[PDB]
């Protein structure tokens, strides 16, 4: 199946390599993990901790830090920003 990012979440995907308008959940996550690596938001020391606070992704998450080993705040955000 396929879903549509919102204008706040789509800007974040088109700044990683994505091109178009509509994607799959699974490739949303690919281009979403690309973002954290290109703009350098992850912790170099403990590479499970992302520091999205300063930038758009954080304002979208309602957080300023989150771990990749507990990513449920991604699935609070992945339901609120994708039209099924």
């Amino acid at each position: 199946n396929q879903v549509r990012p919102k204008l706040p979440l789509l800007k974040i995907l088109h700044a990683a390599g994505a091109q178009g308008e509509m994607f799959t959940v699974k490739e949303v996550m690919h281009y979403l993990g690309q973002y954290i690596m290109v703009k350098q938001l992850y912790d170099a020391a403990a590479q499970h901790m992302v520091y999205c606070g300063g930038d758009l992704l954080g304002e979208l998450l309602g957080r300023q830090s989150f771990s990749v080993k507990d990513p449920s705040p991604l699935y609070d955000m992945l339901r609120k920003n994708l039209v099924t």
Partner: peptide
């Protein structure tokens, strides 16, 4: 460690 495989448990 490595964000690469940490970000592959979710996906």
């Amino acid at each position: 460690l490595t964000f690469l495989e940490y970000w592959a448990q979710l996906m």
